[PDB]
mmCIF file of all heavy atoms in Angstrom:
data_model
loop_
_atom_site.group_PDB
_atom_site.id
_atom_site.type_symbol
_atom_site.label_atom_id
_atom_site.label_comp_id
_atom_site.label_asym_id
_atom_site.label_seq_id
_atom_site.Cartn_x
_atom_site.Cartn_y
_atom_site.Cartn_z
ATOM 1 N N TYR A 151 -26.601 43.028 86.887
ATOM 2 C CA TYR A 151 -27.719 42.813 87.632
ATOM 3 C C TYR A 151 -27.755 41.322 88.202
ATOM 4 O O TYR A 151 -28.677 41.154 89.135
ATOM 5 C CB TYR A 151 -28.958 43.083 86.857
ATOM 6 C CG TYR A 151 -30.067 43.531 87.731
ATOM 7 C CD1 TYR A 151 -30.197 44.819 88.287
ATOM 8 C CD2 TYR A 151 -31.026 42.681 88.209
ATOM 9 C CE1 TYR A 151 -31.275 45.236 89.089
ATOM 10 C CE2 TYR A 151 -32.063 42.933 88.977
ATOM 11 C CZ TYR A 151 -32.183 44.272 89.445
ATOM 12 O OH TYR A 151 -33.110 44.631 90.339
ATOM 13 N N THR A 152 -27.018 40.406 87.684
ATOM 14 C CA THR A 152 -27.008 39.049 87.977
ATOM 15 C C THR A 152 -25.799 38.599 88.756
ATOM 16 O O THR A 152 -25.641 38.856 89.889
ATOM 17 C CB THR A 152 -27.419 38.201 86.756
ATOM 18 O OG1 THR A 152 -26.352 38.352 85.794
ATOM 19 C CG2 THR A 152 -28.744 38.575 86.119
ATOM 20 N N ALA A 153 -24.798 37.970 88.102
ATOM 21 C CA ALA A 153 -23.661 37.577 88.750
ATOM 22 C C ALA A 153 -22.815 38.639 89.363
ATOM 23 O O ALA A 153 -22.227 38.542 90.392
ATOM 24 C CB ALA A 153 -22.833 36.755 87.773
ATOM 25 N N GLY A 154 -22.755 39.847 88.706
ATOM 26 C CA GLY A 154 -22.145 40.939 89.211
ATOM 27 C C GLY A 154 -20.538 40.842 89.282
ATOM 28 O O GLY A 154 -19.924 41.473 90.075
ATOM 29 N N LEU A 155 -20.067 40.090 88.288
ATOM 30 C CA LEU A 155 -18.709 39.737 88.113
ATOM 31 C C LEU A 155 -17.906 41.082 88.217
ATOM 32 O O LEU A 155 -17.940 41.938 87.390
ATOM 33 C CB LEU A 155 -18.433 39.032 86.819
ATOM 34 C CG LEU A 155 -19.020 37.521 86.839
ATOM 35 C CD1 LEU A 155 -19.342 37.254 85.388
ATOM 36 C CD2 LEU A 155 -18.145 36.534 87.529
ATOM 37 N N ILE A 156 -16.981 41.101 89.153
ATOM 38 C CA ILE A 156 -16.065 42.262 89.414
ATOM 39 C C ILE A 156 -15.144 42.393 88.111
ATOM 40 O O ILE A 156 -14.652 41.415 87.635
ATOM 41 C CB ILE A 156 -15.251 42.135 90.671
ATOM 42 C CG1 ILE A 156 -16.205 42.029 91.901
ATOM 43 C CG2 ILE A 156 -14.236 43.225 90.918
ATOM 44 C CD1 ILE A 156 -15.725 41.415 93.137
ATOM 45 N N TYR A 157 -14.971 43.698 87.679
ATOM 46 C CA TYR A 157 -14.314 43.876 86.364
ATOM 47 C C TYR A 157 -12.782 43.975 86.554
ATOM 48 O O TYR A 157 -12.214 44.993 86.243
ATOM 49 C CB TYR A 157 -14.844 45.081 85.781
ATOM 50 C CG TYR A 157 -14.756 45.124 84.294
ATOM 51 C CD1 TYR A 157 -15.477 44.342 83.515
ATOM 52 C CD2 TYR A 157 -13.902 45.980 83.614
ATOM 53 C CE1 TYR A 157 -15.538 44.296 82.127
ATOM 54 C CE2 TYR A 157 -13.787 46.077 82.300
ATOM 55 C CZ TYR A 157 -14.557 45.268 81.517
ATOM 56 O OH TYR A 157 -14.497 45.278 80.117
ATOM 57 N N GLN A 158 -12.256 42.788 87.037
ATOM 58 C CA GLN A 158 -10.839 42.748 87.254
ATOM 59 C C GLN A 158 -10.396 41.263 87.209
ATOM 60 O O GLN A 158 -11.198 40.411 87.659
ATOM 61 C CB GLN A 158 -10.480 43.390 88.689
ATOM 62 C CG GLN A 158 -9.020 43.429 89.027
ATOM 63 C CD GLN A 158 -8.262 44.524 88.348
ATOM 64 O OE1 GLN A 158 -8.752 45.681 88.133
ATOM 65 N NE2 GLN A 158 -6.949 44.170 88.161
ATOM 66 N N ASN A 159 -9.215 40.994 86.739
ATOM 67 C CA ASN A 159 -8.685 39.670 86.804
ATOM 68 C C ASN A 159 -9.595 38.588 86.222
ATOM 69 O O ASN A 159 -10.265 38.869 85.137
ATOM 70 C CB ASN A 159 -8.164 39.370 88.238
ATOM 71 C CG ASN A 159 -7.159 40.435 88.663
ATOM 72 O OD1 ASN A 159 -6.327 40.947 87.920
ATOM 73 N ND2 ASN A 159 -7.265 40.700 89.948
ATOM 74 N N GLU A 160 -9.684 37.452 86.819
ATOM 75 C CA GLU A 160 -10.535 36.374 86.235
ATOM 76 C C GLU A 160 -11.991 36.660 86.208
ATOM 77 O O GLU A 160 -12.600 36.316 85.275
ATOM 78 C CB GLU A 160 -10.236 34.946 86.910
ATOM 79 C CG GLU A 160 -8.840 34.510 86.330
ATOM 80 C CD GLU A 160 -8.459 33.043 86.785
ATOM 81 O OE1 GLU A 160 -9.423 32.252 87.270
ATOM 82 O OE2 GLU A 160 -7.284 32.720 86.762
ATOM 83 N N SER A 161 -12.572 37.210 87.267
ATOM 84 C CA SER A 161 -13.924 37.501 87.298
ATOM 85 C C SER A 161 -14.267 38.427 86.051
ATOM 86 O O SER A 161 -15.298 38.461 85.478
ATOM 87 C CB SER A 161 -14.453 38.065 88.612
ATOM 88 O OG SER A 161 -13.816 39.249 88.921
ATOM 89 N N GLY A 162 -13.329 39.393 85.967
ATOM 90 C CA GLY A 162 -13.479 40.356 84.904
ATOM 91 C C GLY A 162 -13.443 39.847 83.430
ATOM 92 O O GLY A 162 -14.195 40.244 82.618
ATOM 93 N N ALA A 163 -12.507 38.816 83.283
ATOM 94 C CA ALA A 163 -12.429 38.159 81.912
ATOM 95 C C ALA A 163 -13.669 37.184 81.707
ATOM 96 O O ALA A 163 -14.019 37.165 80.482
ATOM 97 C CB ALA A 163 -11.156 37.340 81.913
ATOM 98 N N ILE A 164 -14.286 36.741 82.791
ATOM 99 C CA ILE A 164 -15.545 36.000 82.652
ATOM 100 C C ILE A 164 -16.641 37.000 82.228
ATOM 101 O O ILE A 164 -17.412 36.777 81.325
ATOM 102 C CB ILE A 164 -15.997 35.288 83.927
ATOM 103 C CG1 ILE A 164 -14.990 34.175 84.241
ATOM 104 C CG2 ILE A 164 -17.443 34.648 83.620
ATOM 105 C CD1 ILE A 164 -15.161 33.617 85.719
ATOM 106 N N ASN A 165 -16.757 38.162 82.847
ATOM 107 C CA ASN A 165 -17.680 39.285 82.563
ATOM 108 C C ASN A 165 -17.553 39.651 81.100
ATOM 109 O O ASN A 165 -18.421 39.597 80.416
ATOM 110 C CB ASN A 165 -17.268 40.466 83.419
ATOM 111 C CG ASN A 165 -18.308 41.519 83.353
ATOM 112 O OD1 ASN A 165 -18.704 41.935 82.165
ATOM 113 N ND2 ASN A 165 -18.687 42.128 84.410
ATOM 114 N N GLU A 166 -16.323 39.756 80.646
ATOM 115 C CA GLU A 166 -16.144 40.090 79.197
ATOM 116 C C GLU A 166 -16.566 38.945 78.315
ATOM 117 O O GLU A 166 -17.237 39.172 77.299
ATOM 118 C CB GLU A 166 -14.678 40.401 78.865
ATOM 119 C CG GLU A 166 -14.310 41.881 79.055
ATOM 120 C CD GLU A 166 -15.141 42.745 78.043
ATOM 121 O OE1 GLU A 166 -15.112 42.349 76.868
ATOM 122 O OE2 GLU A 166 -15.925 43.555 78.557
#
Side-chain angles (χ1 to χ4, degrees):
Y151 208 85
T152 58
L155 294 151
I156 298 157
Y157 205 69
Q158 183 74 33
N159 304 327
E160 286 184 21
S161 61
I164 299 165
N165 187 314
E166 271 302 305

